[PDB]
Ligand binder design. Structure first.
Ligand code: NA
Ligand code: NI
Lengths: 21, 30
């Protein structure tokens, strides 16, 4: 998931925004 | 914005900045 993707690869702030409430 | 390499607590800092007062969920694999 996003926690693993951001750390093993890279991720964008727009991907992170999907986890806001 | 630029892409990110974020592990551990650095990812939660990034979620905090992105989401602000909307809040967020931090949901690692188990
Ligand atoms: Na970005
Ligand atoms: Ni560190």
């Amino acid at each position: 998931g996003i926690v693993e993707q951001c750390c093993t690869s890279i991720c964008s702030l727009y991907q992170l925004e999907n986890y806001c409430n | 914005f630029v892409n990110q390499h974020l592990c551990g607590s650095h990812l939660v800092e990034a979620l905090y900045l992105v989401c602000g007062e909307r809040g967020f969920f931090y949901t690692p694999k188990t």
